[PDB]
Design an enzyme around this catalytic site. Structure first.
Site, PDB file in Angstrom:
ATOM      1  N   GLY B  10       0.813  -1.214   0.000  1.00 36.66           N
ATOM      2  CA  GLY B  10       0.000   0.000   0.000  1.00 36.66           C
ATOM      3  C   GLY B  10       0.844   1.260   0.000  1.00 36.66           C
ATOM      4  O   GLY B  10       2.077   1.193   0.102  1.00 36.66           O
ATOM      5  N   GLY B 146      -3.135  -1.597   3.123  1.00 33.06           N
ATOM      6  CA  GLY B 146      -2.189  -1.773   4.207  1.00 33.06           C
ATOM      7  C   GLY B 146      -2.754  -2.651   5.305  1.00 33.06           C
ATOM      8  O   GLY B 146      -2.017  -3.456   5.853  1.00 33.06           O
ATOM      9  N   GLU B 254      17.057 -13.812  16.439  1.00 35.89           N
ATOM     10  CA  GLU B 254      17.607 -13.109  17.589  1.00 35.89           C
ATOM     11  C   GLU B 254      16.762 -11.937  18.018  1.00 35.89           C
ATOM     12  O   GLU B 254      16.693 -11.666  19.214  1.00 35.89           O
ATOM     13  CB  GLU B 254      19.069 -12.704  17.391  1.00 35.89           C
TER      14      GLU B 254
HETATM   15  N1  LIG Z   1       4.247   7.900   7.651  1.00 36.69           N
HETATM   16  C1  LIG Z   1       3.485   7.747   6.571  1.00 36.69           C
HETATM   17  N2  LIG Z   1       2.178   7.521   6.707  1.00 36.69           N
HETATM   18  C2  LIG Z   1       1.548   7.430   5.531  1.00 36.69           C
HETATM   19  C3  LIG Z   1       2.082   7.548   4.263  1.00 36.69           C
HETATM   20  N3  LIG Z   1       1.095   7.380   3.302  1.00 36.69           N
HETATM   21  C4  LIG Z   1      -0.007   7.167   3.996  1.00 36.69           C
HETATM   22  N4  LIG Z   1       0.207   7.184   5.357  1.00 36.69           N
HETATM   23  C5  LIG Z   1      -0.744   6.842   6.420  1.00 36.69           C
HETATM   24  O1  LIG Z   1      -1.338   5.593   6.089  1.00 36.69           O
HETATM   25  C6  LIG Z   1      -2.765   5.638   6.358  1.00 36.69           C
HETATM   26  C7  LIG Z   1      -3.560   5.500   5.076  1.00 36.69           C
HETATM   27  O2  LIG Z   1      -3.208   4.254   4.458  1.00 36.69           O
HETATM   28  P1  LIG Z   1      -2.485   4.169   3.052  1.00 36.69           P
HETATM   29  O3  LIG Z   1      -1.225   3.407   3.137  1.00 36.69           O
HETATM   30  O4  LIG Z   1      -2.488   5.502   2.390  1.00 36.69           O
HETATM   31  O5  LIG Z   1      -3.568   3.277   2.276  1.00 36.69           O
HETATM   32  P2  LIG Z   1      -3.352   2.019   1.321  1.00 36.69           P
HETATM   33  O6  LIG Z   1      -2.577   0.950   2.003  1.00 36.69           O
HETATM   34  O7  LIG Z   1      -2.781   2.429   0.021  1.00 36.69           O
HETATM   35  O8  LIG Z   1      -4.863   1.530   1.177  1.00 36.69           O
HETATM   36  P3  LIG Z   1      -6.060   1.997   0.187  1.00 36.69           P
HETATM   37  O9  LIG Z   1      -5.597   3.266  -0.497  1.00 36.69           O
HETATM   38  O10 LIG Z   1      -7.213   2.205   1.149  1.00 36.69           O
HETATM   39  O11 LIG Z   1      -6.266   0.847  -0.770  1.00 36.69           O
HETATM   40  C8  LIG Z   1      -3.011   6.961   7.088  1.00 36.69           C
HETATM   41  O12 LIG Z   1      -2.972   6.735   8.488  1.00 36.69           O
HETATM   42  C9  LIG Z   1      -1.890   7.853   6.550  1.00 36.69           C
HETATM   43  O13 LIG Z   1      -1.531   8.970   7.361  1.00 36.69           O
HETATM   44  C10 LIG Z   1       3.462   7.799   4.134  1.00 36.69           C
HETATM   45  O14 LIG Z   1       4.092   7.935   3.092  1.00 36.69           O
HETATM   46  N5  LIG Z   1       4.102   7.867   5.354  1.00 36.69           N
END
Ligand SMILES: Nc1nc2c(ncn2[C@@H]2O[C@H](COP(=O)(O)OP(=O)(O)OP(=O)(O)O)[C@@H](O)[C@H]2O)c(=O)[nH]1
Ligand SMILES: Nc1nc2c(ncn2[C@@H]2O[C@H](COP(=O)(O)OP(=O)(O)OP(=O)(O)O)[C@@H](O)[C@H]2O)c(=O)[nH]1
Ligand SMILES: COc1ccc(/N=N/c2cc(OC)c(OC)c(OC)c2)cc1O
Ligand SMILES: [Ca+2]
Ligand SMILES: [Mg+2]
Ligand SMILES: [Mg+2]
Lengths: 155, 436, 426
Positions: B10, B146, B254
């Site tokens: 994701g 994710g 570990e």
């Molecule tokens: N630290 C960090 N958080 C991120 C990033 N991109 C998204 N988020 C966080 O991840 C969450 C959203 O999930 P995403 O990873 O964007 O979603 P995905 O896995 O692509 O899932 P869908 O788009 O719903 O199919 C939120 O809590 C965001 O703030 C990034 O590059 N870094």
């Protein structure tokens, strides 16, 4: 049965047919299955010329159907301003109440017919009349946020 | 040398993966095209960097990594970016339609359209390994992909790779930079279904990283680029023992032995110091005692919680740079004379120490100043249950009204799965209380 | 999730629909002939969401135009962007519906529904990854209301996994004093509760009230009302059409805005309000949450927000927006439900609309929308109790129980809003 044909002609707006049926003894005060008369039908469907004709030939301007609706209640509900005025000039009861506690004022306020509301108030419509739920026309204006209507009721 | 495969799922897993592999290349001296001039053995090798990088007959060093997303936007940035030639093109897998922030779509309906392809591509990387130890899985808790796709993937990896270790780097949601209202639901559903399939998981609280960017780095409104550069620094510190010579956390097993006393309480807290802004290039150099004391301050943690409220079960200190071992011994001795550091009575009160004498690398364009010594502390403390309670409460507020539940049920998921997931979290909260 | 297939049905649907295409074409640098005359690269990044790319780099709207009245096609054709529509996409009958929902839904409309579906199939099969559909229509007439709901149901059977979104114009006696309009709107709301994922409620009562009381227009025309409609439609579609730090689509909007399946009726808002041919961040956040700026005649201070999405357009400090949005949620804390944490989402788009440097658009899912439904219900009940004009409907093969069922469903919808307005976290 000319009364049944007079009911149909009043609803359809056939002026000539109304005059002909009356000339041959048709009951101007005939009723359909729900107590509606030719006057109720002409007032519901907006046939001003038929309303005036019937009123000059013995129609009861305050006839009620089985639900207590007068021709004035129906004219005010549908919004026929000119018919409302003719009915009032011929003695219609401005404060007649139907089985739901509604007066013509309530129906004109609900449907947003502001010009009719003004006419009714000018003819002595009661602003304190409550429907079966305790609502006056002013309560309706407040509960629905109709500022235009609320201003008219305060004038 | 035993290989490690990284899997990035994701948007969050992919963007953090891009930043990590960029840093790993700079630390190992690998160019964006894959060439490494310090590698005297062409076409292969058994060096410590070979745990994360395979080698071609042409001298190209390729990450042992897979990038997966249900939509293509984010992965397309990797395909056309600075490190576009570094990855195996078949290593970047994209669907057409994402999980719309819905765990059930990622796990049960959309995710099933690509799961077999992802497993066949992972199999091709596993087949190139002489002694695969396991997987590092990067993902958000809050996204539909994710959360849902990662759970489905972790279930399948347990069947096809039974004896291999699985470690996660998970992004825990914060209100300041979140995407969806349903992130607490996704977080609890993925935690429940992955618990028995993961050996160790490092949670990264977006609110903790956001506050560090604002306070230490003077970044008014941090973006994902700023958060990811700091997160990659911390991830590199955690994985350094796998990629370089060392005497602590030298293999995935570990990490479990040192940090996980019991299988369900497998969530260590990471702390990192010092974080200094790049605009302060001439900063005074902090001693081993200063950076070590900084690991016990809640402001430097990767997860917002208060370790003074909990008990420790394990503590590992990983230093990088100009660090004399006797200075670490003296700094630790001073820490033992502090009443706010309590260990459980059934664990030896010791601290495990690993030192890598190369200072950390800074990424050009980054927000961090260069430092001559840094430390990453990994601890298993019961205070991390505070993070679970915060998430559980937001879940309970919505779930009591069944708000949004119809979106999950409409995507092939039973309503009872929500209660089974919440009950598992109530038991996990009790597991921390039983330890202390 | 990329392409959207837009349908416009009936007079209101086609008039507001044409205005939508004129406004967004101007934003995307598209001229009335279909050519791109813009300067910013941000205008073509997501152009595919609403337009099909054609020969000679010509952009043609993915729009289907439907009406039982053939005269509507001519008014559309005579417009500035009237030649940009694909000639095969015009589906028009011979006789109108005469404000009869039963003609639109069961007789005239049912004869013309297979023809429209043929055009929808042709447009859908040419999409790489269809998101769903958007329909513009009024609920007070016969074609947009009766035929529109039939089209929604038939599209639903053929594409059950795609999103269905409507821009539905609610009747008011202040703009149209036709007494059968509450019947048509009630019968339509009964269909919309079951068959759409999201509906923007655009109320002619609020549109008229804004023109008359706020813009000082003594005799508001359809053109004045539609100016407010096009600014609103431009605002709520911003993030589908421009990149931004979010990859928004119709399904992510539904999952995050709709906590209960029947409660998918949104109250849109817009600031600043302007008349045809005629600002700071704290003022924009203020105006945005004011009853005078809502496109539905409901006071949001009479209910509670379940969810809110706001879009700011123009050049402004993103930190200032976060601060003002945080401030409004603290000082207006009793107007938000406590059991849906972080229920307010903001987005900032660099490109503002035409004639404005700053603009804010509001999308609320508020329990106060029950005031709109109670207004229509009271008018439906006043007519229905007297059985006025019922024969006009039953004469087209409609059972009288269809009216009772629609009335009962609407009152149930009102009770559902009241239930969550009174719910507490504890
Ligand atoms: N630290 C960090 N958080 C991120 C990033 N991109 C998204 N988020 C966080 O991840 C969450 C959203 O999930 P995403 O990873 O964007 O979603 P995905 O896995 O692509 O899932 P869908 O788009 O719903 O199919 C939120 O809590 C965001 O703030 C990034 O590059 N870094
Ligand atoms: N805001 C707005 N309302 C409109 C417009 N045109 C019509 N209306 C409203 O729409 C309702 C009538 O619906 P129409 O769209 O005229 O009817 P139709 O869908 O063409 O149906 P028939 O003519 O009965 O076949 C009334 O409430 C009108 O006030 C317009 O351009 N703007
Ligand atoms: C309450 O929580 C939330 C609500 C809505 C969310 N975003 N939804 C969108 C979708 C859009 O596409 C049409 C937008 O374009 C109009 C859009 O403009 C800002 C936002 C995300 C949420 O976490
Ligand atoms: Ca080698
Ligand atoms: Mg995504
Ligand atoms: Mg029409």
């Amino acid at each position: 049965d000319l009364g049944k044909k007079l009911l149909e002609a009043a609803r359809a707006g056939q002026d000539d047919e109304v005059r002909i049926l009356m000339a041959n003894g048709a009951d101007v005060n005939a009723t359909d299955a729900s107590g509606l008369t030719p006057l109720h039908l002409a007032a519901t469907y907006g046939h001003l010329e038929i309303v005036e004709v019937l009123l000059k030939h013995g129609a009861d301007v305050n006839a009620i159907d089985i639900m207590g609706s007068t021709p004035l209640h129906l004219a005010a509900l549908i919004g026929h301003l000119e018919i409302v005025e003719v009915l009032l000039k011929h003695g219609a009861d401005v404060n007649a109440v139907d089985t739901w506690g509604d007066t013509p004022l309530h129906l004109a306020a609900i449907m947003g017919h502001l010009e009719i509301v003004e006419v009714l108030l000018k003819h002595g419509a009661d602003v304190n009349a409550q429907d079966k739920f305790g609502k006056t026309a002013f309560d309706i204006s407040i509960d629905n946020g109709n500022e235009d209507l609320a201003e008219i009721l305060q004038k | 040398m035993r290989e490690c495969i990284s899997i990035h799922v994701g948007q969050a897993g992919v963007q953090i993966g891009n930043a990590c592999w960029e840093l790993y290349c700079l630390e190992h001296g690998i160019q964006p095209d894959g060439q490494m001039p310090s590698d005297k053995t062409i076409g292969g090798g058994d060096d410590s960097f070979n745990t994360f990088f395979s080698e071609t007959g042409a001298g190209k060093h390729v990450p042992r990594a897979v990038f997966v997303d249900l939509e293509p936007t984010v992965i397309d940035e990797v395909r056309t970016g600075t490190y576009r030639q570094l990855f195996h093109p078949e290593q970047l897998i994209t669907g057409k339609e994402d999980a719309a922030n819905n765990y059930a779509r990622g796990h049960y309906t959309i995710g099933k359209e690509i799961i077999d392809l992802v497993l066949d591509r992972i199999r091709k990387l596993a087949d190139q390994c002489t002694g695969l130890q396991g997987f590092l899985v990067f993902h958000s808790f809050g996204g539909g992909t994710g959360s849902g796709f990662t759970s489905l993937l972790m279930e399948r990896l347990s069947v096809d790779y039974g004896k291999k270790s699985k470690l996660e780097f998970s992004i825990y949601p914060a209100p300041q930079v979140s995407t969806a209202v349903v992130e607490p639901y996704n977080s609890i559903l993925t935690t429940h279904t992955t618990l028995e399939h993961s050996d160790c998981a490092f949670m990264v609280d977006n609110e903790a990283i956001y506050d560090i960017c604002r306070r230490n780095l003077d970044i008014e409104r941090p973006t994902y680029t700023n958060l990811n550069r700091l997160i990659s620094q911390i991830v590199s510190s955690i994985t350094a023992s796998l990629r370089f010579d060392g005497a602590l956390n030298v293999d995935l097993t570990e990490f479990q032995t040192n940090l996980v006393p019991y299988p369900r309480i497998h969530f260590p807290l990471a702390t990192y110091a010092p974080v200094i802004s790049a605009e302060k290039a001439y900063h005074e150099q902090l001693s081993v005692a200063e950076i070590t004391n900084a690991c016990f301050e809640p402001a430097n943690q990767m997860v917002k919680c208060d370790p003074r409220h909990g008990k420790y079960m394990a503590c590992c200190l990983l230093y990088r740079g100009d660090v004399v071992p006797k200075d670490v011994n003296a700094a630790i001795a001073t820490i033992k004379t502090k009443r706010s550091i309590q260990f459980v009575d059934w664990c030896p009160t010791g601290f495990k120490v690993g030192i890598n004498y190369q200072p950390p690398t800074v990424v050009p364009g980054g927000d961090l100043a260069k430092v001559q010594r840094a430390v990453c502390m990994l601890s298993n403390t019961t205070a991390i249950a505070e993070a679970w309670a915060r998430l559980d409460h937001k879940f309970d507020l919505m779930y009591a009204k069944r708000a949004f539940v119809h979106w999950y049920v409409g995507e092939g998921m039973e309503e009872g799965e929500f209660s089974e997931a919440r009950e598992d979290m109530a038991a996990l909260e009790k597991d921390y209380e039983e330890v202390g | 999730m990329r392409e959207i297939v837009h349908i416009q049905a009936g007079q209101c649907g086609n008039q507001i629909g044409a205005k939508f295409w004129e406004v967004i074409s101007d934003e995307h640098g598209i001229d009335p002939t279909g050519s791109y005359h813009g300067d910013s690269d941000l205008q073509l990044e997501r152009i595919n969401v609403y337009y099909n790319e054609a020969t000679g780099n010509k952009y043609v709207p993915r729009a289907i135009l439907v009406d039982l009245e053939p005269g509507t096609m001519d008014s559309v054709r005579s417009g500035p962007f009237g030649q940009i529509f694909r000639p095969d996409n015009f589906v028009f009958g011979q006789s109108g519906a005469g404000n009869n929902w039963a003609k639109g839904h069961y007789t005239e409309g049912a004869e013309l529904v297979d023809s429209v579906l043929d055009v929808v199939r042709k447009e859908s099969e040419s999409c790489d990854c269809l998101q769903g559909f958007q329909l513009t229509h009024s609920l007070g007439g016969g074609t947009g209301s009766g035929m529109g709901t039939l089209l929604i149901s038939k599209i639903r059977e053929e594409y059950p996994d795609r999103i269905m979104n409507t821009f539905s114009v609610m009747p008011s006696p202040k703009v149209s004093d036709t007494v059968v309009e509450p019947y048509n709107a009630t019968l339509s709301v009964h269909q919309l509760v079951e068959n759409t994922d999201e509906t923007y409620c655009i109320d002619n009562e609020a549109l008229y009230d804004i023109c008359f009381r706020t813009l000082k227009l003594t005799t508001p025309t359809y053109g004045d009302l539609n100016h407010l409609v096009s600014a609103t439609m431009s605002g709520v579609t911003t993030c589908l059409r421009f990149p931004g730090q979010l990859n928004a689509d119709l399904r992510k909007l539904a999952v995050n805005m709709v906590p209960f399946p029947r409660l998918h009726f949104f109250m849109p808002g817009f600031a600043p309000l302007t008349s045809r041919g005629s600002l700071t961040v704290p003022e924009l956040t203020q105006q945005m949450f004011d009853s005078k700026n809502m496109m539905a005649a409901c006071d949001p201070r009479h209910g509670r927000y379940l969810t809110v999405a706001a879009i700011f357009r123009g050049r402004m400090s993103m930190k200032e927006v976060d601060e003002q949005m945080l401030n409004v949620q603290n000082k207006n804390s009793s107007y938000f439900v406590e059991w849906i944490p972080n229920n307010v989402k903001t987005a900032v788009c660099d490109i503002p609309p035409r004639g404005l440097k700053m603009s804010a658009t509001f999308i609320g899912n508020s329990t106060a929308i029950q005031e709109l439904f109670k207004r229509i219900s009271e008018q439906f009940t006043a007519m229905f109790r007297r059985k006025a004009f019922l024969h006009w409907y039953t004469g087209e093969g409609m059972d009288e129980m269809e009216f009772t069922e629609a009335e009962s469903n609407m009152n149930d919808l009102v009770s559902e809003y009241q239930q969550y307005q009174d719910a507490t976290a504890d």
